[PDB]
């Protein structure tokens, strides 16, 4: 289990946190649990909507969710009909006043998580994994990624002996802390088993 | 051992049974699982078949057994020898 998590190593420097609140040792665990719940719910709901990052932020006994999604239109539905619906359920989950914001993700081919999800979907609907991977890589490159890597693993083409294959393009420096490396993962629950998809997308280096 | 201020321990049900026995004046063995129960003065004379995990083993109570517990006279493990 060689490698360090690319997001996790960079949280202090170039990457920010998702859950962004303060709490004392008393209420912290509970808060975490709540976050887990709400996030889980959101994932369940907005599966068909291309959702990248849920950012929870709770000040003053009131939860502020921020959903980063590629297509707001399907998450919002009719203007303030679906969002509103989501909100009350979120509140219920939390046990506090809820507030949902929806950030529009520019360039969903450069968002790593989204790409991974897409790949997983493709796998599920029985495409050639390799061709999917290629598409993922190519598209990102076209869009202006300084580099991208993707990796898929296990029961590829329903084969008895599992293996991993991966496509890199451009440069993807992981040891370099100041590199904006959007990393994320997904899992294709195929007929032969799970197929895990990792993808690293290098936006560029930050100078500060 | 248990604190002196707390007193001795005996299971309530067991105690009740003992009392009943005393009242009767019978000497049929009382099958019991309360190995943790301390023996009492009033229990002297009674046979009380204490569980050892597997079976109830008869224990005729004596004047010397009072301070002790019922599980002390009902050994659980059954080792004969290595050869």
């Amino acid at each position: 289990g060689q490698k360090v998590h690319p997001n996790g190593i960079r949280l202090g420097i170039v990457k920010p946190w998702n859950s962004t609140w303060f709490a004392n040792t008393k209420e912290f665990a509970d808060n975490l649990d709540s976050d887990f719940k709400v996030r889980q719910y959101l994932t369940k709901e907005l599966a068909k909507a291309s959702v990248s990052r849920i950012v929870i932020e709770r000040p003053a006994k009131s939860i502020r969710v921020t959903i980063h999604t590629a297509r707001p239109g399907i998450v919002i539905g009719k203007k303030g009909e679906d969002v509103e619906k989501l909100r009350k359920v979120v509140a219920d989950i939390a046990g506090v006043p809820a507030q949902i914001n929806i950030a529009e993700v520019r360039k969903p081919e450069l968002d790593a998580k989204l790409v991974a999800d897409s790949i997983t979907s493709q796998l599920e609907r029985r495409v050639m994994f390799r061709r999917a991977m290629k598409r993922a890589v190519q598209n990102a490159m076209r869009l202006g990624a300084k580099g991208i890597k993707v990796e898929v693993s296990g029961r590829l083409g329903g084969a008895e002996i599992a293996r991993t294959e991966w496509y890199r393009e451009g440069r993807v420096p992981l040891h370099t802390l100041r590199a904006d490396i959007d990393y994320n993962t997904s899992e294709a629950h195929t007929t032969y088993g799970v197929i895990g998809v990792k993808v690293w997308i290098f936006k560029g280096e930050i100078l500060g | 051992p248990r604190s002196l201020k707390k007193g001795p321990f005996i299971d309530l049900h067991l105690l009740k049974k003992v009392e009943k026995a005393v009242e009767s004046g019978d000497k049929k063995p009382l099958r019991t699982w309360s190995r943790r129960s301390t023996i009492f003065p009033n229990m002297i004379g009674l046979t009380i078949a204490v569980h050892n995990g597997r079976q109830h083993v008869p224990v005729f109570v004596t004047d010397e057994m009072v301070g002790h517990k019922l599980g002390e006279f009902a050994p659980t493990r059954t080792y004969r020898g290595h050869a």
């Binding site: 009719k78 203007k79 303030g80 509103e84 950030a103 529009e104 993700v105 520019r106 | -």
Partner: protein, 110 residues
């Protein structure tokens, strides 16, 4: 005033429950507002009010460093007592005239 956020709204050409001015009238009366911040350069106010009667500018739940210098600036005319309105205004700071068309793609913060 730059961005106005009313709850239970779809577009600015709709109408709302319990008010007089329509939403374009509310946006014009908010465009006339006169705010004076001191420390920050971008603040978010809050206006919450229910009950029959006009909604002055003096009903905005002010923070410490914002000063609303027109306490008789009318915005809405709430007529139903079961009606409510909860808008969240955003006040930037600049110069000149920057309009909605140019600020339709200029805005970077998604």
């Amino acid at each position: 005033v730059t961005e106005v956020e009313i709850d239970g709204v779809l577009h600015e050409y709709s109408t709302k429950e319990g008010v007089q001015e329509d939403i374009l009238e509310i946006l014009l009366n908010l465009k006339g507002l006169a705010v004076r911040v001191q420390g920050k350069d971008e603040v978010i106010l809050t206006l919450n009010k229910s009950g029959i009667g006009p909604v002055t500018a003096a009903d905005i739940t002010h923070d410490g460093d914002v000063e609303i210098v027109k306490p008789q600036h009318v915005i809405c005319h709430l007529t139903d007592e079961n009606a409510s309105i909860s808008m969240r205004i955003k006040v930037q700071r600049g110069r000149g005239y920057v309009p909605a068309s140019t600020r339709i793609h200029s805005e970077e913060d998604e």
